[PDB]
RNA sequence: UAGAAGAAGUAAAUAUGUUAGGACCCGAAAGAUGGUGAACUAUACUUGAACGGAUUGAAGCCGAAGGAAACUUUGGUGGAAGAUUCACGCAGUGUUAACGUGCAAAUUACUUGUCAUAUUUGAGUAUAGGGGCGAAAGACUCAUCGAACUAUCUAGUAGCUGGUUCCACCUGAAUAUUCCCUUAGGAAGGUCAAAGUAUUAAUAGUAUUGAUUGGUAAAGAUAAUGAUUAGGUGUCAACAUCUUGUCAAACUAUGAAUAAACAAAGAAGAAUUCUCAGUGUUAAAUACACUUCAGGAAUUUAAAUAUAAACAUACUUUGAAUCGGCCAAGUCUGGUAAGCAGGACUGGCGAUGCGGGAUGAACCGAACGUCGAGAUAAAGUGCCAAAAAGAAACAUAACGAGUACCACAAAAGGUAUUCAUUCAUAUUGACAAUAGGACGGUGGGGAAUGUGUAACAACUCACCUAUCGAAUGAAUGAGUCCUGAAAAUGGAUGGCAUUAUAAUUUCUUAACUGAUACUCGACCGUU
RNA sequence: UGAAACUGUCCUUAGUGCAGAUCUUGGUGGUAGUAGCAAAUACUAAGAAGAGGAAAAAAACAUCUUAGAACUGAAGAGGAGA
RNA sequence: UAAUAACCGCAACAGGUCUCCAAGAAGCAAAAUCUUUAGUUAAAUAGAAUAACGCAGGUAAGGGAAGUCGGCAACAUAGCUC
RNA sequence: AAUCCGACUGUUUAAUAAAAACAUAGCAUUCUGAUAAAUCUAAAAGGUUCAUUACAGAAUGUGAUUUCUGCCCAGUGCUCUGAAUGUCAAGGUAAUGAAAUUUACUUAAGCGCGGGUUAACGGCGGGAGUAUAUGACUCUCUUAAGGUAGCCAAAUGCCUCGUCAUCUAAUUAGUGACGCGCAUGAAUGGAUCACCGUGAUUCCCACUGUCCCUAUCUGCAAUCUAGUGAAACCACAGUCAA
RNA sequence: GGCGGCACAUCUGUUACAAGAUAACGCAGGUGUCCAAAGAUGAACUCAAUGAGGACAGAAACCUCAUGUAGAAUAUAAGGG
RNA sequence: GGGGUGUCAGAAAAGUUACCACAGGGAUAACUGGCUUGUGGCAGCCAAGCGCUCAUAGCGACGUUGCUUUUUGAUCCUUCGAUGUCGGCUCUUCCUAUCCAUUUCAAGCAGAAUUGAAAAAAGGUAUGAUUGUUCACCAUUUAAUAGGGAACGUGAGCUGGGUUUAGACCGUCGUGAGACAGGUUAGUUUUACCCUACCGUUUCGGUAGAUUUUCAAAGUAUUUAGAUAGUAGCACAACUCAGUACGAGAGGAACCGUUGUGUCACGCCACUGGAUUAUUCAAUUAUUUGAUCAAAUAGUGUUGAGAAUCUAACACGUGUUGAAAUAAUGGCUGAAAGCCUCUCAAGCCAGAAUUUCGUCUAGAUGAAUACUUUGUCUUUUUCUUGUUACUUUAGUACAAUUGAAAAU
RNA sequence: AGGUAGAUUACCUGACGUUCCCAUCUGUGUGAACAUAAUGGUACUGAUCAGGCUCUAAGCAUCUUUACUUCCGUGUUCGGAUGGGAACGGGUGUAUCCUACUUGAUAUGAACCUACC
RNA sequence: GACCUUAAAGGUCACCA
């Protein structure tokens, strides 16, 4: 028993994360936020693509997850465990409220109690982000569109001129990579500061 | 902290406000006091009246038969019973019949019950209102009873409902705050009116310049308190340390916009010079503080942001109504949500008509003495309906489109159509098509794609030549269209109607139409 | 039309202005020539009296007498009392 | 007068109000029904036509409570002798 | 043919309830020796039962007969033929003081203390083991007493249209059983029914316009006419869709 | 309306909108106290925690050094100091 | 200063009324309606899987988007000087989110029986036991025994079973009066004669442009006419097809044709049946005519037969009926796009219980004919039941140039 | 140059090392008395044998930190305003105001009175 | 659901229409 999503879509009232103030809250259902090859080193991983809300509203912890399970379905059948990595990045921070009426029961007079969570999204922040190589491109990007059918609202795919989840676009890091400013760490890269101590 | 400081009060007639009285008029259910009723009904007593026919057959008594006896069997007689029934009457079970402005303020018809001893009934008599009487229903006590009738207190009280009587003119509101046995109501106070003043250190819902205040929006997240996903490095955890992803109404370093409160020359429009006293601080003071920048005299002087303000400004007194509110939103909180509930700021409706939105308390323009002429506003120009012509496009083979608030439509799908971007082949020959080959080891121009033969075989496909001559193929975005799309009386772009529009979007033209608003003119009134 | 009192100005005074109160009292409409004038068996012919049965059937006619036909049915629609 | 007109109910109100006298038939019966003595034929108007819908009284083929809350209403049994 | 209620005859809410309600006989309890009990009255050589005298008077509950009325006196009543030195008034006594005043001691009922009484108001329990299920048996908690004899989805049972039979083709209805019974139960009377009832309920036979499914007959109206002739109601009025 | 609750006198944080004011039976909590010292003053000292040492002695007894912006304590709810 | 008012600017204060009363209230609940749609109902999008293989024959998890007002909620805007509050009975209409019949497409459709979907709302959709029931559950029957709205349709339409006053009983609660979405039983259902609507039925009025006297117009009468409005026929069974198609077998159809039945609608009185105050004919009980005859009375005494008239769900006839165009769908030719394609292109065909003609009922302005008239014309008076012609006093006009291509 | 008293209260702090001390300051010796504690460690008092070892002060560093500038960026947000577009959600255009975090460059103190050198 | 109590379990309330 569950209510309809169109109940809680409209971002509504100040945020009401829980806290020693707000008790009982169930526990969200999506708990894996990055999912593939997630110590793949920087380089192999050269695309981006990344899934933009276009609207103001509410997304609740089970659209995430439905999704968060569709694309991991279908990404581990395209290019295998080991030639992706897909990073959700909206958590369910923010705790709905359910006032459930049982004639006999008060009309109104009572606050509601906690119903699940959602992560309050606003237009132009990326939802969820993937990177991959060019031979998994068109399957990355196919997984992705039908991660779309589990949200509301309107979502929009951007394939990013930049590189995997860095912040320079493809030339710039290989530039910066040759030169020695790019220092790979496992998974992502630590920029070479000319700043602090000098060594022996 | 009242008073005095060369007295102001008093009397009478009005008006207004408070107060008491019937108290602006009408309105309770109630309470008390004194009387009248048992001709209706209730019960009781006295004295009278009224049982006709059937059914059943208790004691008591007699005959016959049997018996030692006790007694029994049988046939009669008798006529008891708060016994069974019919009738004169009476009641009121049912039709929930008739009637229901009736024959009748409780009756009529049939059916039903009952119809003499706890019976029916006449007259007399007794019991009276916090009383009587009751085989008990709060029943009856003159059509009046969970406390009769009648008159006085009494025009009882009402924070509640209804009504409240001539004209013109001028000004014109309220839902905050405090308290109440307060929440349908009052007093203090705010808003408003009328009277009466003061030459008036007595102007500002504004901006600017200058010095400030604050912690909202935003921002941050090994910056403090918390929440949370991972990845490196050092000594599988774990612990440190370096990055990463995402957050806070009851977290914060930082921190706007809008605002709040100052100053921009009133001991009376500045400044300087000279002289200068009383107290006190001070170690003592000529310093310093206050004393009309104590005081007194000379000289100079109207200066010191902008804008507005003399029917300006400051008021004083008396008093009315009012504190049920409602709507809108580039706002917020609870709620799934509400034409829901409650708030911050402002504008409105209430109190408000006029022109437009077909119609509408709030929407848009704009607020109104009586008129004439013109330019206009919102908004419109196929007809209803006053007013337009031209230009280009995406629409339109459909109850598609058509004046915001507003009276609805979503996700998704389409080799439907228009434009744009990206990539590939684009010719010396791409795609579509017609003709041919599409193979040997290998039962291993693709191990040959599919049809196909048990299978090789045959056809056919990718592919390659021949023929044929200008675009072709793929992806993505932005419009429009179609499906998605189902409700109950017959109907709603307002209707008719339009369809290279009379639809939608944008334009061009010193085009046009139109308000009680603007301008000019005349007249009425207020100041 | 009406046939004996009345008006204009200034002060004064007030039982001073009505469309509403289910207002009070009085009068009057539409409804409307409408709903009705239907329990109790029932009247008819000839004549008399009377203004009061006429008439193209105006189909009905109150009282009294006679005749016909009937009802109450003797716990009466009879004869008498409180 | 003593009441379907003299009393009480607003009245010439189908309500109410205490008594006496009491023929024949038939029958168990003062029952229902009819008649004699007495009373009356008028007791809130009639005439025509013979629609619907009614009020009052009835019947009905075949089935027999299937109707309905429910045999409500109506039908059905009915005296006397053995 | 049965079920429920009331034993019966009787009475009752005039004008929506005629009954299972009231009365009743029977049963039971309480007080009173009459100068009393009950009780009217402002008072009274006043009044009623009472012209009476415990087989009587007055106050109550239950409701014929049969069978039977279980346990509880803690709580609240009622009562005692009962205890004094707990608490208790006006008074009375005594002291100080100039006096009012103040102070101390002593006083009745009542309550408290103790007993009786339930046909006085009333009340009458839980939890766990244990012989394919049930649990005779046992342990344990603590009431004044733990609902006894009986009776039951009842006019009393929420769950509930309880479960099993029977009645029917078909049964939320009826009847017979079962009973951890929300919340039955003994003169607040328990169980039982013979006769009786214009009482409530179910089933058979018979009969039928209740019905299949309506037809038709009569009188009085309604219709029209002569005479006569009201009332309720009425802002103005009277075609629809959105 | 009743039952429930006290939003009825009253404090803190938040809703609350960076002056003041400020709603809901909005949210998270609190009061009807406690104290001859827990009032006044003077002086001395520095807290929580961590690391490293020291017989029994260890994860926790007592002692010492170092780091230690309050992460302790301040009667109480929360916020300030 | 203290003793306190906690309702804290501070009275001294227990209940119940179902026997109830008054001033008021939509400032405020119980019913409809209105906003919302949580909940109830229905519908979609993606595709993890099921479906022996196979995501999509048929389903569709994890998610997600809607519609409806047929449940109950949430609010308190309208009604408190009153909108009669459940169900059933009767009757009409409307919606489609369709149960049957008709036409199609799909299947894991061999046949039969089925399942999913489209056009389509013109026609049908029942009888009973228990319950006041809505709902439900059983027993039947049927082609099917679908779901809903209309002030939760419908009380001057009925009923009064339930709920919901006043009597009474039980259980639990309360010391008591008394309470009980606890049970049981008894309990008055008023008025249309007004306006409109609907159904029928009368009265008066009436349509403008032709002048070939073989003409034109008015009055009366008949014969016709048909803008518009309504609409009607459905369904089943039996024979044959045929034990055939199909299928290993088990089983097991359909088209044409023929013949009936049921219902609905319109009629009808011959045959069959029913009512019957022709108080017809006859009989007969009680009373009264002295008896016989002949009657009367008992509001139609009663019984048997009973014509006429009316009527049958009880008798019996007709609605078997024709053309064209269509919807969903299947196709033809055929581009766009050299090929393909039923056409989100032009152009055609077949295809429904569909639509329109044809047919049936009511019907407006009309037309023809017969007779009476008039021939430039009316107004106001006036006779008649009414109409036309007609009568009187006056005024007015007087034969002669208007107005046509069609199609694209 | 040093010491005492300060004002600004990190440009003044913290970590790592470094430089003099000639005066001054500090550290340094002692415990008899004032005074002090468990302890002459502290505080108290008396003193001058030694020392720059610490303190102090001055400077060093691609130092954490802190303080100004630019940039971030006219990007966040915001005051006013439609019969502007959208079914909503939200987001334009116009006249305007305009942060923050981060990053980069720079700085690591200035200044007042008294005495002594 | 609301109030109370115990070491999840009980107990009382849940009414006028």
């Given at each position: 028993?569950?209510?309809?999503?169109?109940?809680?879509?409209?971002?509504?009232?100040?945020?009401?994360?829980?806290?020693?103030?707000?008790?009982?809250?169930?526990?969200?259902?999506?708990?894996?936020?990055?999912?593939?090859?997630?110590?793949?080193?920087?380089?192999?991983?050269?695309c981006?693509?990344?899934?933009?809300?276009?609207?103001?509203?509410?997304?609740?912890?089970?659209?995430?997850?439905?999704?968060?399970?569709?694309i991991?379905?279908?990404?581990?059948?395209?290019?295998?465990?080991?030639?992706?990595?897909?990073?959700?990045?909206?958590?369910?921070?923010?705790v709905?409220?359910?006032?459930?009426?049982?004639?006999?029961?008060?009309?109104?007079?009572?606050?509601?109690?906690?119903?699940?969570?959602?992560?309050?999204?606003?237009?132009?922040?990326?939802?969820?982000?993937?990177?991959?190589?060019?031979?998994?491109?068109?399957?990355?990007?196919?997984?992705?569109?039908?991660?779309?059918?589990?949200?509301?609202?309107?979502?929009?795919?951007?394939?990013?001129?930049?590189?995997?989840?860095?912040?320079?676009?493809?030339?710039?890091?290989?530039?910066?990579?040759?030169?020695?400013?790019?220092i790979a760490?496992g998974?992502?890269?630590?920029?070479?500061?000319?700043?602090?101590?000098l060594?022996?």
């Amino acid at each position: 028993g569950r209510r309809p999503g169109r109940c809680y879509r409209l971002v509504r009232g100040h945020p009401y994360p829980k806290s020693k103030y707000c008790r009982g809250v169930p526990d969200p259902r999506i708990k894996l936020f990055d999912i593939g090859n997630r110590s793949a080193p920087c380089d192999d991983f050269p695309c981006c693509v990344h899934i933009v809300g276009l609207e103001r509203e509410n997304i609740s912890s089970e659209a995430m997850e439905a999704a968060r399970i569709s694309i991991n379905k279908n990404m581990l059948k395209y290019a295998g465990k080991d030639g992706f990595h897909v990073r959700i990045r909206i958590h369910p921070f923010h705790v709905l409220r359910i006032n459930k009426m049982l004639l006999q029961t008060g009309m109104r007079g009572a606050w509601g109690k906690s119903y699940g969570s959602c992560a309050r999204v606003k237009v132009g922040q990326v939802l969820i982000s993937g990177r991959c190589k060019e031979q998994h491109l068109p399957a990355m990007i196919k997984s992705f569109r039908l991660a779309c059918y589990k949200f509301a609202g309107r979502q929009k795919l951007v394939i990013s001129n930049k590189w995997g989840f860095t912040k320079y676009t493809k030339e710039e890091y290989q530039q910066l990579k040759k030169d020695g400013k790019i220092i790979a760490d496992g998974c992502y890269f630590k920029l070479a500061t000319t700043k602090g101590p000098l060594p022996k």
